[PDB]
């Protein structure tokens, strides 16, 4: 579980998106595992606009924030699960770290702000859906 609240938007994992997210959809991308929906109140999370490769992420399976080195967003092959088949997910960044399915939504952050949220995992690796290129989230 977990979301980003920036302006009048809510960013969640497309596979965890609620009924109310679809009844107010703004943008969604199955290959990115991202879904943006509309909120009534203003959000206060700042999105990082940078090329940072070091940061801190929340892991709910450990009630802990872990510092990590992560690769740049890339087209990475992801194992088949009950939400998606085995395919290449785009804008994905991998780090060596603990990750469990219920961890999806935990924010990855650098000194510039919010980099993304947990999307993939297993094998002692944790994958994050980058949001630093969705420049429109700030404006409108
Ligand atoms: C943190 S995910 C994880 C952690 C430990 C083990 C396995 C996983 C993978 C998983 O169960 N899923 C469920 C949907 C998934 O998040 C996904 C796929 N593509 N985009 N989102 C991958
Ligand atoms: Zn940064």
């Amino acid at each position: 579980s977990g979301a980003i609240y920036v302006g009048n938007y809510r960013v969640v994992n497309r596979h965890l998106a609620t009924h109310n997210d679809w009844a107010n959809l703004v943008w969604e991308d199955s290959s990115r595992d991202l879904l943006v929906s509309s909120t009534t109140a203003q959000g206060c999370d700042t999105i990082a606009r940078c090329d940072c490769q070091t940061g801190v992420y929340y892991c709910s399976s450990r009630r802990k924030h872990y510092p990590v080195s992560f690769s740049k967003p890339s087209l990475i092959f992801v194992e088949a699960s009950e939400y998606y088949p085995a395919r290449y997910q785009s804008h994905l960044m991998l780090a060596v770290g603990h990750s469990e399915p219920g961890d999806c939504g935990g924010i990855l952050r650098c000194q510039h702000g919010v980099v993304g949220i947990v999307s993939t995992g297993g094998n002692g690796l944790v994958g994050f859906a980058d949001v630093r290129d969705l420049l429109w989230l700030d404006e409108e």
Side-chain angles (χ1 to χ4, degrees), residues 44-65:
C44 293
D45 284 310
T46 296
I47 303 319
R49 305 303 185 183
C50 71
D51 68 3
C52 282
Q53 287 193 248
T54 73
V56 165
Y57 83 107
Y58 184 58
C59 178
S60 67
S61 75
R62 293 283 180 276
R63 297 192 189 109
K64 234 178 232 68
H65 296 261

Side-chain angles (χ1 to χ4, degrees), residues 85-102:
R87 86 235 202 273
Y88 292 89
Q89 176 159 304
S90 53
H91 301 251
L92 196 52
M93 299 177 291
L94 308 158
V96 173
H98 187 67
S99 182
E100 278 171 50

Side-chain angles (χ1 to χ4, degrees), residues 3-57:
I4 312 151
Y5 293 88
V6 41
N8 276 254
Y9 304 124
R10 161 167 151 111
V11 185
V12 287
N13 285 92
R14 201 206 172 246
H15 76 287
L16 298 188
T18 85
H19 168 87
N20 201 89
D21 286 332
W22 293 102
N24 280 295
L25 175 62
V26 179
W27 168 90
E28 57 80 50
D29 196 323
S30 171
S31 90
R32 291 182 66 150
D33 181 54
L34 292 176
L35 193 139
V36 175
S37 76
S38 53
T39 70
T40 38
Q42 278 250 303
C44 293
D45 284 310
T46 296
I47 303 319
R49 305 303 185 183
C50 71
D51 68 3
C52 282
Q53 287 193 248
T54 73
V56 165
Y57 83 107

